[PDB]
Amino acid sequence: GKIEEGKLVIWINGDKGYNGLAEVGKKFEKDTGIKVTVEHPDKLEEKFPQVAATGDGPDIIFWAHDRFGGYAQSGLLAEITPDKAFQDKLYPFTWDAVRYNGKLIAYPIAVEALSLIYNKDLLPNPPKTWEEIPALDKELKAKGKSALMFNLQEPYFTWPLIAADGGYAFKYYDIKDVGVDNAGAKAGLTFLVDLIKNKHMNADTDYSIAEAAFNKGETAMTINGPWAWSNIDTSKVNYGVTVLPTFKGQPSKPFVGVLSAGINAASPNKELAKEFLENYLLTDEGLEAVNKDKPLGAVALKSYEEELAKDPRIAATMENAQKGEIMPNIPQMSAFWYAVRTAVINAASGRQTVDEALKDAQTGSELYRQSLEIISRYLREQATGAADTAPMGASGATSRKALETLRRVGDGVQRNHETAFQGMLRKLDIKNEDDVKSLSRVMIHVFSDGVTNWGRIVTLISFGAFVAKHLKTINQESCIEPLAESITDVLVRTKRDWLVKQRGWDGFVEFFHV
Ligand SMILES: OC[C@H]1O[C@H](O[C@H]2[C@H](O)[C@@H](O)[C@@H](O)O[C@@H]2CO)[C@H](O)[C@@H](O)[C@@H]1O
Ligand SMILES: O=C(O)c1sc2cc(F)ccc2c1Cl
Ligand SMILES: [Cl-]
Ligand SMILES: [Mg+2]
């Protein structure tokens, strides 16, 4: 393979204590003679699936648990198999965050939740509600200070406020049911936009800018995680850590993250990675080394969390955590976060209204589950000849109308392309499920190679249905679902922005309206 044997390459995010992780890597290297190299690559969450998909990258990947299901679904992660005794050392709910389709896919490291961080010298008694912040800012502005600054370039920091009055990602599961553009999410984001409009916040504010302003004593409040406390210590700001403000009487609900360590599927050092993580990192001395660099929050190791739990900053973290919710690790979390990131930024800058911004994020977040439902039902009914009598569910009218339209249009497309599809199927060799995997690599390169329209999308799906029929014919009907997922994955990954612009399958329905 591409990844070197007899070495350990570890990737972790730049806001985390990588120097302390490196210290742990030095202890491993001292004992074993095996080199350990810690890196903190830019845009790590995107760079890992890119390089791992080619069989390259690090042996160990660090991130919050939410993106690991996507990595697993893409076959980028090795199943981890700790013994019972090691499992019993970590909190059961942390293992839950790294379980995907029955299988553990990472070692949970620490529980991360956003808190309100405030300057005691400027703000002795921090606001219990979001609604008193504008007035609080006015008071402070008279003294040369602002009330609140936090990163507005990542939806992670804004999500507590969005979710406060009833906003949610995926109902808890029902992945089809998405609450990104409901009334509560709209209210939450609207308040945020008004803070900006009324000059209480700046739309351009990011992580560095916010951190800098707070640690320089310029703003009385920031919103951040445990990892940030180190820099505030160095700045000597008299700071406190408390519960996030409420919005409309309801608690802010931070989407809780579990920093986890995964093992590259293509790593030839899986046993080494296992030794490092279990016997060097997930120890009292291991977790402390990292914690002393940048705080981890509430760690998964029971023995060490018992000592840290006494810290009122940790207690506050867990208080915010208990009011929020653990992230899903479903594969389309990446799409969700991207959709919401854009929505928050576009609303903040005025590029979009809150209503339209959230609608798009709603469509983006629905896109994979909506598309799979239609494509899977179409391929299955084309193969067997009989429709699925099961209710569509959430939405519902969109799924049903899109399938009707796909049937009508797809019939003429399959008839006309029958000779072309026969030729394409013979050129490939789809005998079993092992061959379905290869298909996506051929589709993705070809289908993304021109101007997009609904016509080409129907052709793709129709070839899907054609292959589905063939699979049933040769007694490989079990492959129809993986095929539908592969086609769906290709469609939604390569044409995401186009599809959103088209208002998703509503556009497909309208375009072919008879
Ligand atoms: O903003 C979207 C982003 O949210 C979370 O990322 C967090 C991460 O969990 C924290 O440990 C810390 O590094 O802050 C990040 C936000 O900048 C999700 O984990 C991530 O997948 C998502 O893209
Ligand atoms: O991108 C497109 O429009 C086309 S043309 C074509 C021909 C085939 F035999 C199979 C798929 C396909 C696809 Cl997608
Ligand atoms: Cl989960
Ligand atoms: Mg729209």
Nearest to 219 by CA among 272, 158, 294, 143: 143
Residue 402: give its domain's CATH number: 1.10.437.10
Range of the domain at 423: 332-512
The residues, any chain, with a CB within 8 Å of residue 253's CB and separated by 6 or more, are: 159, 160, 163, 164, 323, 324, 325
Atom of ligand 2 nearest to the CA of 446: 1
Residues 352 and 167 sit within 8 Å (Cβ to Cβ): no
CA atoms within 13 A on the CB side of 491: 32
Q: How far is CA 369 from the centre of its chain?
A: 15
Exposed/middle/buried for residue 402 (C-beta within 10 Å: 0-12, 13-18, 19+): buried
Residue 204: give its domain's CATH number: 3.40.190.10
Residue 458, both tokens: 């129907």
What amino acid is encoded at 150 in this protein?
A: F
3-state secondary structure 308-330: HCCCHHHHHHHHHHHHCEECCCC
Residue 95, both tokens: 């293992």
**PDB resolution in Å:** 2.4
Nearest listed ligand to the Cα of residue 181: 4
Strand partners, 178: 170
Nearest listed ligand to the Cα of residue 224: 1
Q: For ligand 2, atom 2, which residue shows the shortest CA distance?
A: 456
Nearest listed ligand to the Cα of residue 339: 1
Nearest to 330 by CA among 441, 171, 180, 479: 171
247 shares its domain with 337: no
Q: Rg of the Cα trace of the chain? A: 25
CA–CA gap between residue 494 and residue 442 (Å, rounded): 13
Cis peptide before 297 (omega within 30 of 0): no
Atom of ligand 2 nearest to the CA of 423: 9
Q: For ligand 2, atom 1, which residue shows the shortest CA distance?
A: 447
Q: Compute the distance from residue 419 Cα to the ligand 1 centre, in Å.
A: 48
Residue 224, both tokens: 């951040």
Residues having CB closer than 6 A to ligand 2 are 420-421, 424, 447, 456, 459-460, 463
481 shares its domain with 336: yes
Atom of ligand 2 nearest to the CA of 424: 9
Cα-based angle 401, 403, 409 (whole degrees, multiple of 5): 100
376 shares its domain with 496: yes
Neighbours of 143 (CB within 10 A): 9
Residues having CB closer than 6 A to ligand 1 are 13, 15, 45, 64, 66-67, 112, 154-156, 225, 257, 337
DSSP-derived 3-state class of residue 217? coil
* Approach to solving: X-ray
Residue 133, both tokens: 């912040």
239 shares its domain with 134: yes
493 shares its domain with 388: yes
3-state secondary structure 144-155: CCEEECCCCCCH
Cα-based angle 370, 373, 374 (whole degrees, multiple of 5): 90
474 shares its domain with 336: yes
243 shares its domain with 337: no
CA–CA gap between residue 341 and residue 361 (Å, rounded): 8
351 shares its domain with 443: yes
